[PDB]
Amino acid sequence: SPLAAYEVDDSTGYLTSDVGGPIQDQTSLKAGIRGPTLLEDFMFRQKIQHFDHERVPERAVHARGAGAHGTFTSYADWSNITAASFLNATGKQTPVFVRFSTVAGSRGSADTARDVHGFATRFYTDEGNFDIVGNNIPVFFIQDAIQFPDLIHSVKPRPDNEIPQAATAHDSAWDFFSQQPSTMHTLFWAMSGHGIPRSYRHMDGFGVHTFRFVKDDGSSKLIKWHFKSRQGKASLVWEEAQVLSGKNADFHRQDLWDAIESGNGPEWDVCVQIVDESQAQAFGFDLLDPTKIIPFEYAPLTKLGLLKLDRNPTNYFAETEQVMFQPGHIVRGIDFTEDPLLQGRLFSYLDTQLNRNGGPNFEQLPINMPRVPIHNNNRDGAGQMFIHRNKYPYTPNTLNSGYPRQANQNAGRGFFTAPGRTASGALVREVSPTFNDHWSQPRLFFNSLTPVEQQFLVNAMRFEISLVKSEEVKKNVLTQLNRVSHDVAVRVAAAIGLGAPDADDTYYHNNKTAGVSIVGSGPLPTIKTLRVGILATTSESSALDQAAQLRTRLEKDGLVVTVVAETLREGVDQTYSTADATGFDGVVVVDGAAALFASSPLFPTGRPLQIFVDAYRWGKPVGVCGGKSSEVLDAADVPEDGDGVYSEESVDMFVEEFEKGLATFRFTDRFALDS
Template sequence: MPAGADQPTNYAEQQGHGGETRQTTSDAALTMTTQQGIPLADAQNSLKAGLRGPALLEDFILREKIFHFDHERIPERVVHARGYGAHGVFELTDSLADYTRADVLSTVGQQTEVFVRFSTVAGNKGSRDLARDVRGFAVKMYTKQGNWDIVGNNIPVFFIQDAIKFPDLVHAAKQEPDRAFPQAQTAHDNFWDFASLTPEAWHMIMWIMSDRTIPRSFRTMEGFGVHSFRLVNAEGRSTFVKFHWKPRQGLQSVLWNEAVKISGADPDYHRRDLWEAIESGDFPQWDLGVQLFDQETADKLPFDHLDSTKLIPEEDVPVRIVGTLTLNRNVDNFFAETEQVAYCTQNIVPGIDFSDDPLLHGRNFSYLDTQLKRLGSPNFTHLPINAPRCPVMNFQQDGHMAMRNPKGRVNYEPNSWGAEGGPREN
């Protein structure tokens, strides 16, 4: 018998080292609990009637754990499902105060928190990173005047001119409905059939067949707002603007045979590259550039700048660099941040406005429907990743998972209750 075996053992006081099948703690701060905060003495065995069961209906710990697991998944995005995000900061280096009253574009040196999500368009969540596909480049700026989203791509044009064609474009590009393949690429008969009957798509197709759609890294991708927007200054004068992100790492892509080999070896190549760069302190940066032009310049163009299948050559309207975006922090939880972040083209701040681009108007209309479907409530803006960093005050209330509601007796406007009557228009 080993020495000391005849001595009683106090198992309740033993502390493990991380490899035990049942691990306990005496630290109240580390005690496992249910979602209701109830401490758990055993989270690995369900309650049973007798040694061999059956399981008991009264086991609320089992019920809650299975219930939550059964409801973990939310609908993936119809497009841009495979994405990867990171936190960062935008710093203004050249004021546009003459063109816009937007605070984020007016004060040189001002830093604004951002969250950026990169993505492929056609592939599902589990597809590979290096598919030949358009890439999303979406930037959420948490400005002092509210959230401003630049929901862009890595190509400056788009397939269609009118949002009414968007469902058909996506259906044609995604996997064919009877066989559910191919995914993560548009090189299949349905897409080519659609493209052959959609002449305006061919500018975009020329970009897709170039090396722009197989970037070497998210860090070496350009980004474009695609649409014409407007900047509006304090006097109410507006100027057309197109937004550009220029990577300081340079513009780099891979060849097709490289993409095929990399996809077989590491389908997570792009997300791994971004994560490791930020973790190592090699923070990627992009310069924000703007093309500014007035109605007179627009009238002289040989095409309609409100047509998203066209671009304005930079030699005709130069890109002015006004700020720098730096990604410097990885997410703490992929689902809570990258998967739940909700971008929308209609999220603009005072001093930025829409143009008459019909595709842009269709996007403005569509995004809220998507976010309600995916996140389950009009209160998705209460989620930390979507919540503005400035005060939020209005009379909107209730709905699933409301985390804040108006205080006091008033939930309408106009009202006669003076200072106690809640927020007022500015």
Template sequence: MARKPYATKTGNAGETQQRGGALLTTNHGIPVSDNQNSLRAGARGPTLLEDFLLREKIFHFDHERIPERIVHARGSAAHGVFTCTDPIPELTKASLLSTKGKETPVFVRFSTVAGGAGSVDTPRDVRGFAVKFYTEQGNWDLVGNNIPVFFIQDAIKFPDLVHSVKMEADRGYPQAASAHDTFWDFVSLMPESLHTVIWAMSDRAIPRSLRMMEGFGVHTFKFVNDEGKVSFVKFHWRPVLGTQSLIWDESAKLQGADNDYHRRDLYEAIAAGDFPEWDFAVQVFDQALADSLPYDVLDPTKIIPEEIVPLRVVGRMVLNRNPDNHFAENEQAAFLPSNIVPGIDFSDDPLLQGRLFSYLDTQKSRLGTTNFHQIPVNAPKCPYANMMRDGLMQVQVPKGRANYEPNSLDQAGEDPGPRASAEGFVSAREAVAGDTLRIRSETFGDHYSHRALHQQGRGSGRRSRSFLHRL
């Protein structure tokens, strides 16, 4: 096949062209004539330092690995589309939920929490359910789990929780499973973890397929409409295939037979056109309802029962495209709970508040640069512009003389730089007052009745959809 050296239909000069009969080159575009033999002095002689082809290739290979995620290291991902099926402009001005039939591209990453990137798919563990919506108002990352509650109430306990659930510090095992001594030790000293421990020890923690998992935003968030009216909201994903689990015996056998059971299942289903789908539902309530509950809606160890606040399905997500490249997309995906769009806002849940710091911070350590947003899987699909500049691995070439705002040089010209506008993100208005204290609110104090209430099966059959014995 004739090789196409530079400009082709799929690759222009200056772009990388990995297929379509491309000529093999170095990373600097120099054509390679021999990719089998390094440069030697004589057929059996020493290799020459001069061999820049060899050195560049080995250099790049030596640095292929980047730090894996500190949690949720093992994940499987897919692209898809979210369609609004029941618009709710009266509740939120978020554009993706404004019009029936409106489509928003998404990237989803499902993950285990405790194991490393090369660990197995089927241990007993919470699963991550992270969705990046590429909306026309910027990226909204709903970084949730397949269990609707969390082990701890305050972000300051997260490093302790994770240290206890990951492999034990002296022996380096178990690699991926949550049920082991240091975890039991930690949760036995943390009564607030009880509710989530029961979920984690249920069948929920060994999903049959990533296509058969529910997803939950866990925290209470806020919706804000055009008039600035604020409601509380909890987010739910419901798999169209139903929620299904493996039994322990099945998962133990699968771990021996196929470490990539979930990853393979997701990839093959999508490749075969058997696209997984989820309904997206919201539970919306106001302050009066929040006040009527015997626990705090800001406490992430609690659910809002569905017989009290029913779910409203507002959209459907279909995953219809496998990543082209596992590293470029799955590994380099950076989800940030702090990525929200106009119409959605954070609550004061103290776990959520800590997360808002943690994810932005961790991306610098893992992806190495503040410019991780330029990686294609992370970049917004809408235009974005600001005066943030430079930094490691800057690949954009901003134009203009003035890189500050306001300025009178470029602003006055024909091609002015970006300015803030009233349509931009505005935080929900809330009165905040109080003393500076390291204290847990008393409304977070009851770790037992909530769980017991639901285990007794109080309420309608419908309510069990949101709880354990649904399985």
């Protein structure tokens, strides 16, 4: 592997320059002990020049993100639908690297901003690097790549003052959404819990675009990529996300890192919907339109294989920051479609790496290298790391015996354009009328959420639109929301002091589709990695014993347990001063600590009770363990009878009930609904 050859050990030995000369780096060379620094101090200048030049441009979008290495394993020989080599045998393994991300924020912005999320997968296949550059949402805002800068300028900070960071909650974004109705479907997804996932492991990945599977005999089928999480789908609530943005901007990357380090590396089933070329327009929309899904009911999922992430980077900068994905990284057996969004992307990703890398040899960075030999006539450029032996790098040649040889459909396992593809008609800059329904599928999505889920979506819209200064933009937003759902428009209007326009029912329907609801997707299939805070005290020896007994029982089942108290000591992981409800998926108070829940110089006034109250209000399983229970639950105004509220003297019975609650994950009856 190209990474291993470039690993550098500094666990021993003496400091050297970059050219291997032993040096010091702690005191500048000076003319006298209190004297000026000398220009001839090369030790100073090489060190500071390196430092001065450490930074590279952040990615234009998806700047904030994190990555890990792993493995993809095929479940079968897929030759009957694709020639792709990495899919050609039961059990065949290909290394992968994945980077997850937000979209709009800059590099040090918060993981738990409300946004679309990137899910970018590189397969280092035995017939070339193959990238699926996907999002956690199956549809995209716009229908033509040429609009991308318009979308991204609108959602990024206002360019006079660069406010606000990593948020769509400002005039420009809603101006764009309200003026470009294609945006409705992705907007609805981003305003649902899909915009604030619990973790990278608790979201799915989507190619978005229709692609082609191409067999060795030239025939082709249309496909959508779906990466289905084996950890289950789950979301934060918005108020939790906001606090978490400030308490732990690194929440998602820490979650991923820790799961990998604990042997709980996240998994996905890599799947496709496969349909015939003749069905491009058979489902009531156009498969070239990236604002549309194929409903579950129209085309089932085929599981191709297993994706597992199981090793973290050695150097974040060298691996994660420098990984340079491209949908242009395609392999034989896969082909593009005439999706005008996809089409333009192919240009973008090749070009943008020149900005990032500062030179054209970015594919020679170890993370970007393939795992097979490279034979081509590309030469020179800044940062050229190869020394090519072929001194006749042109085709056609006799002086290098005609090497390298041309690869195509017939020979050398060449990539080839699906031979059945055609183009026909005028050279136009016009939108296909097949793309014009911007509202039906947003409504399909909305109809498929549970009542509380729909309320959450409405409440996200209420929150964002209320922050828009322009009355005209707000009106314009309501006009578009109304075309999806009158009810949505009425409810959102109520919060911003406007009347919703009259119902316009052109695109209203009551159809639903399976698999887009988080709330409705059943209990989590595993509770491994979920975080349990146990609130205790050092004042009572019994409180620490109760915490220790709980620790053992919960850790047995793969939960990450944090015992909290006033101060650190053996058995105590965190102080109240540093703890927060955003840090846990469930919160347990031991009844020996009841005195704290009713001042100290060691933590802010009310902190112990605030953690419990916040956990309860954010829908989490909460409880008191010990059998003197009512004191804590009364002080918190948490009802004993409540769903997801636990009161037991028995440690074993407490844990058994609580774990079912962690699986349920969120208790939604605790959220108010509109009339």
